Amino acid sequence: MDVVSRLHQKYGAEVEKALVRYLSIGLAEDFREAVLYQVKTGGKRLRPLLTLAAAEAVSGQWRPALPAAAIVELIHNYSLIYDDIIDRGDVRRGLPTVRKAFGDNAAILVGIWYREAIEEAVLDTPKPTLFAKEVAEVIKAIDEGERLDILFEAAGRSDPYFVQARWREVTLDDYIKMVSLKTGALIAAAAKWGVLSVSDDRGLAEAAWNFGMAAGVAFQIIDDVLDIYGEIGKDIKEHKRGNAVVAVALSHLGEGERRRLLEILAREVVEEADVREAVALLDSVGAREEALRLAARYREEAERHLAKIPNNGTLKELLDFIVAREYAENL
Amino acid sequence: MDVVSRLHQKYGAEVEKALVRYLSIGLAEDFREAVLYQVKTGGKRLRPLLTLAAAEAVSGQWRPALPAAAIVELIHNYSLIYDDIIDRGDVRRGLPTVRKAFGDNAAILVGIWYREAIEEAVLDTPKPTLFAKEVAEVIKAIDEGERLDILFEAAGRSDPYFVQARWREVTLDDYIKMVSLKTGALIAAAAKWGVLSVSDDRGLAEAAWNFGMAAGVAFQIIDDVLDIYGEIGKDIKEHKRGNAVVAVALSHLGEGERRRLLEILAREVVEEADVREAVALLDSVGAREEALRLAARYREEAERHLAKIPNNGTLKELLDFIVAREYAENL
Ligand code: DMA
Ligand code: DMA
Ligand SMILES: [Cl-]
């Protein structure tokens, strides 16, 4: 029994109850199914589990962190609803997305509703004005990270802004700034908010934040590796320079090899043979191994921050699962 | 010089400054133009003017209400950004909409940003946790009102939810519930929030709320009359049962006339001759005059609530302008 299965057994029912409770406030009966849909499609709930484990580590209690746990999971799902609209995603967690089942525009009315459910949860935390400010900052970080990820694409969008503001160059630093915002900030928030729910120790809150950030970066990097070396080459087909292996490669490839890889990424339809050729360019500079070493760097940073947090056994198990440690080292 | 021109001269520059200030917090330079766009396209700013006039009426000061004034105008514009996406609107205030100039999906990233700018303004008010709760309630009221308005349509959408959840019947009561939410609540909030910014008198806050609600309903009704009798018959072309004249008519028309009017509204493309025929049905039961009498009812209610508020001269001028009193009585 993994730490996730165990924490789902301990915290799960209460997490699901809290999500429904905040979303249900003021919710019209004939809109209920549409609004509850995104939280009824499953998910690992890793973020709220992290929130509750962090609270429990520092204080021995997890229940006072339930409102914070619902905030972080509701923000996750709010971002997913709009992500599916923007990317026109049809499937998630093996089921139709909100935009697919209900329509793009119905999905927007749902997303708008989620942000106010998040606000109800904020008002239900131990420190409402502090949570309110951190929620605004984290949502803006996610929005900015998403903006950057799209502008780091090499092709494939029909929004004049995404086309015209597309960045000319994407460095490894750029890539790290982007994933810290898009993926890291909300995982940093999950940990930090668990601590804030049960403790006024600022040092512990800051350690939990730094721990979640680093873990989220390590996770995204690994995810990016899978999304290249497996459906082989999914991020190449999708024109992404905001991919760790690609960004690593672009930093090492010679001028002609560099120009070629960008040419492939910018192809309106990327063929199988384009993928293979792109992967060969990546391998020609050992980009995959370098990406995985970068993931190790952040995983080790997460561990140093985590060492500052008391009673951290369960959080250490979650970290290993989150950064898919066992798997990554096997690769 | 009308009350609006006068209040724009007094409050305007400070209102515009506050909008830019909250939106600018944490705003990336290359996203600035896209995000500031919706507030740089003009607008009467009637809502924040009402906020500031209400504060000034009860306390003699308007500046402490600037954060509340920015909240209400930012909510207005947040709702407009998504309204333009959902309705695929190309033009607003004589210029391209955000979705038009930047793209539907860029518009979403902008809308997401507006809600967090609204939250920064909330944190800057005299009573942050109270404002935070009222903002969540009012945004949910707008979202629900919008949901109802779309489900009150007789045709014309491609979202499975809008088609499948479309209401079978739309009564006058239904119509009033809908406009109270879609239009009234935020105008009620504008007034009430001005009072809350400078006073703990609950009776005055409640009077300002009731005053703004009633004014917003009267305004929407009149707007609906214009949107029938003038571009003649715009709401008929757009399949709206959520129109005061239409809703009045449906309540009085005989079975065959009633069935016919609905048939016209449900026509996938409504022709000129369908409009004229629809208008004749409306006139056959004096629906326009009845709608305007309903607008008078709410305008008179607004006045009774307004009478409970001290030093109310300017607020009375705004009310007349808001419910286009002079014009309505001329019609
Ligand atoms: C933090 C982490 C490793 C999450 C993995 O799943 P997900 O959050 O991307 O998706 P879901 O919400 O479906 O579990
Ligand atoms: C409250 C009221 C009578 C508003 C009229 O203008 P609007 O708010 O619909 O549009 P804009 O924001 O462009 O002035
Ligand atoms: Cl507990």
Ligand SMILES: [Cl-]
């Ligand atoms: Cl003042």
